[model samples]
Target: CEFSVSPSGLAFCDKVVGYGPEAVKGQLIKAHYVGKLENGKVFDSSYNRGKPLTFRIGVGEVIKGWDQGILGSDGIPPMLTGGKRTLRIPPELAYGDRGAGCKGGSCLIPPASVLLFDIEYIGKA
Candidate 1:
């Protein structure tokens, strides 16, 4: 899919289609993701952690955009297991003005920053 933007400002594009069951709520999803700022600065990566992030789809365990976009919500097609997708998330859908990854007064992600994520749904975990 081309970069499709939702009314809520989440944008997503499918980089590679996957086979098998379509992702849905309740299934735990294990996905590898690289998150960056709109300036292309890397903030976090699952590969660096040597593990994919695991969370239930469509739940509030992650940022709003991630929960909504990862499963292809907001008028886009749902992702299947093994799908690779790129998601563009505005601040509201991300950490918003509060931001995240703060430590000792320094922060990896600043407030109100737009985020970009390249995600590969490895499988259900």
Candidate 2:
């Protein structure tokens, strides 16, 4: 079965707990992640779209989820450098009622859709 949602209800599944250097709030990191919808639809992926997509946690650079969820409840990032994790995020975290999907007049991530992600920390960027 899948793992449970994050502490703040931002995401589901905590497959791998962090170990090394923590990428907590107000930090920039090279985000190696694959984003998907609940129906197993891939919305975005650094592995698929491009390479080396970096993000600063707890910032508006990424979604509200990434800003909140990337770091664990204690405000410590669960996925450290070279660490890996699998999490499924609820709408409020991913994009809330306003889905982040709008490409060529089509919706990739429908509004209020729960999102899943395979994330990895490639160290500070």
Candidate 3:
């Protein structure tokens, strides 16, 4: 199937469609994701960590980019709860100037980092 456009400075591609219900705002969801910086540096990965993350969409449980990444655009239908996607998010949609985590600590996502995320929806949490 075709894919939809993300908000400005953001974009994504659907890799596979799911069979579950469509995930909407306020719905709880389980997902796997891999995050990387512009220079190809790895930041986070649920697969690497050996588990998935669960949260409520559009609830700031994650980042702004992630909240919107699960949706679909024109031509492409909304992502079902079990679908997967590759999201390219701009800095503005990510950590912005504040950045994420601490460089020398638990979080290493730097400020203004353009991130590419591989997301797999694991259905409702």
Best by TM-score: 1
Each model's TM-score, in the order given? Answer: 0.92, 0.81, 0.82
Q: Each candidate: how many clashes?
A: 0, 1, 0
Report the Cα lDDT for residue 121, model 3: 91
Model 2 lDDT on a 0 to 1 scale? 0.71
Model 3, span 4-120: residue lDDT tens:
454475677778878878888788878998998878888899988899987788788887778777754433346687788888888888988678887554458876788888889
lDDT, each prediction: 0.86, 0.71, 0.77
Those runs of model 1 whose alpha carbons end farther than 4 Å from true positions after fitting are: 103-106
Which lDDT tens digits does candidate 2 get at residues 1-125? 36655466665454665566877678878878888787788888998867968778766887766656566654334666776777767787677766665875456788788888888877788
Give every collision pair in model 2.
Answer: 5-12
Between candidates 2 and 3, name the one with more favorable lDDT: 3
Look at candidate 2 and tell me the lDDT of residue 105. Answer: 43
Comparing 1 with 3 on lDDT, the higher-scoring candidate is 1
RMSD of 1: 1.6
| Sort order, TM-score high to low | 1, 3, 2
